[PDB]
Design goal:
By secondary structure, this protein is α+β, with helices and mostly antiparallel strands. The protein has three helices and nine strands; from the N terminus they run βααβββββββαβ. A six-stranded antiparallel beta barrel has the order 1-2-8-7-6-9. Strands 4-5 form a two-stranded antiparallel sheet. It binds flavin mononucleotide, cytidine-5'-diphosphate, chloride ion and magnesium ion. The PDB classes it as transferase.
Length: 134
């Protein structure tokens, strides 16, 4: 019962909001722990063929944090493989509980800035590979 989903998504730019959350040190740490890498401090948004459902997959989920008088909600994280060319890089789909962006926009995280390491630009279509269901 081995499972593969392979989803083309279009590289897109958003409202600048990824980076403040991936810079927040507890997030830096939880992703180091949960994934075995420190994400570059952003999220590569990819625009999808159709709505995405993290709950059909064997996600990790983070505890909420509270500091500076604020409540920081859980995020659901799902290891993936980012497929660019004949290359095959390891990352993760983060799906925050509360995000501004409708649900065919998935946010990707990886140790490197994907736009530089991989010369991506708004419009480019990349593929992501999800092994396993829930
Ligand atoms: C790791 C992570 C944690 C987030 N935590 C919160 C949060 O606690 N509260 C909130 O309103 N949005 C949270 N967001 C979602 C952002 O507010 C925003 O909707 C969007 O995902 C930021 O990415 P963007 O600028 O690439 O579109 C989080 C996003 C990520 C990547
Ligand atoms: N691993 C990553 C994370 C973000 N990014 C990009 O880094 C910039 C910072 O990401 P962001 O999520 O804060 O901003 P947007 O995704 O809203 O454009 C954006 O251009 C992302 O597309 C990247 O190239 N590689
Ligand atoms: Cl755009
Ligand atoms: Mg982003």
């Amino acid at each position: 019962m081995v499972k593969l989903m392979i989803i083309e998504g279009e590289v897109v730019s958003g409202l600048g909001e990824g980076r403040y959350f991936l810079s927040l040190p507890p997030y830096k740490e939880i992703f180091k722990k949960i994934l075995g890498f420190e994400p570059y401090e952003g999220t590569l948004n990819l625009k999808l063929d159709r709505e995405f459902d993290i709950n059909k997959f064997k996600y990790i989920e983070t505890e909420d944090f509270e500091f500076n008088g604020k409540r920081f909600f859980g995020v659901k994280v799902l290891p993936i493989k980012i497929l660019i060319g004949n290359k095959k890089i390891d990352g993760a789909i983060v799906v925050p509980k509360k995000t501004y962006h409708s649900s065919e926009i998935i946010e990707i995280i990886a140790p490197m800035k994907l736009r530089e390491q991989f010369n991506l630009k708004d419009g480019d279509v990349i593929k992501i590979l999800i092994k396993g269901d829930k």
